Structure 1
Amino acid sequence: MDIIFVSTGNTCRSPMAEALFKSIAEREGLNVNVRSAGVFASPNGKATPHAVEALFEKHIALNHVSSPLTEELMESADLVLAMTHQHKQIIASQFGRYRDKVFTLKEYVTGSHGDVLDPFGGSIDIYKQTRDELEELLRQLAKQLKKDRRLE
């Protein structure tokens, strides 16, 4: 029931995923704790302006503080969903004890190997396309988690 989304900087995809998923899960009455982290994150970080603007259009306020992935986070998580395969492997090399909870978002939800590509430095339309890709995956993730008895 404790889910963590992980990207590189924890400024774009992963905070977007966390905010979109919180919104979706609350609509559906899922019992989840949602967090996000970055494998190379410098905290004190806000989400990027385009990430914030992309969610703002969907009436979601992306108020976020960037955070590094910690051993404490890895331990409390039931599921760790990485944006790309490279993230998955980086997490696995640093937190090998917890590899069994780490999957890419696309592989966990769709069964397909695929990455959620980095929008950083891109235009607002790049971010809106990332938002839309994420929302689709996350709506499916929400329906799937409904069947997980770990939701208590």
Structure 2
Amino acid sequence: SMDIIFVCTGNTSRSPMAEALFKSIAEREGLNVNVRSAGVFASPNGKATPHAVEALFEKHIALNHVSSPLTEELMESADLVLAMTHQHKQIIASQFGRYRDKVFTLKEYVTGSHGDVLDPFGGSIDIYKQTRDELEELLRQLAKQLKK
């Protein structure tokens, strides 16, 4: 049981979308994983943002999410910590330097190239769908790679 945690700042849009998309993908691929998300600056009271929920609902995936701060406990239990952006990775490694060797951006880990997941902040539902689609492409490739 590999423990994966997707991380962004607020844990209301990209990282919870990644978590829900990847849970679905991994199950269909027969990959045994425990999947979570958290935010380096998250409030504990938050929900996923309406457009994030709707974007996944379109694809018949439920995004029923409560935002969670990234903690030492989560970092200790993780096998991989996949950041949405390279600044998220920097922030994580600053706070949790002992666990640097678990932390990568999603794009560098899967594709080998530096890059940040498309930010849907302030966007219409269609921008959120673009982020969803980019995440799905990355996460389908992640599932294939982790099964090795």
CA contact (8 A) 2:5 2:37 kept: yes
Counterpart-to-counterpart distance in 2, 1:120 and 1:42: 17
In structure 2, what is the equivalent of residue 89 of structure 1? 90
- CA distance in 1 between counterparts of 2:28 and 2:119 reads 27
Tell me the residue number matched to 2:71.
Answer: 70
CA shift, 1:94, in A, is: 0.3
In the TM superposition, what is the alpha-carbon distance from 1:146 to its structure 2 partner?
Answer: 0.4
C-alpha offsets along residues 34-69 of structure 1, whole Å, 9 cap, x if unaligned?
Answer: 000001100121100000000000000100000000
Task: Output one character per residue of 1:58-100: Cα deviation in whole Å (capped at 9) or x when no partner.
Answer: 0001000000000000000000000000000000000011000
Structure 1 runs (4+) deviating above 3 angstroms are: none
SS, match of residue 4 in structure 1: strand
| CA distance in 1: counterparts of 2:21 and 2:138, whole angstroms | 10
Give the root-mean-square deviation of aligned CA atoms.
0.5
2:83·2:89 contact (CA, 8 Å) conserved in 1?
yes
- Tell which deviates more after alignment, 49-58 or 113-122: 113-122
Q: Which moved more, 1:53-62 or 1:113-122?
A: 113-122
User: In 1, are the aligned partners of 2:5 and 2:35 still within 8 Å (CA)?
Assistant: yes
- Per-residue deviation at 1:117? 2.9
Q: Give the TM-score normalised by structure 1.
A: 0.96
SS at match of 1:11: coil
Query: C-alpha distance in 2, partners of 1:44/1:51?
Result: 17
Q: CA deviation at 1:135?
A: 0.1
CA distance in 1, matches of 2:129, 2:10: 18
State the shift of 1:127 in Å: 0.1
8 Å Cα contact 2:118/2:134 also seen in 1: no
- Do the aligned partners of 2:39 and 2:67 also contact (CA within 8 Å) in 1? yes
Secondary structure, aligned partner of 2:56? helix
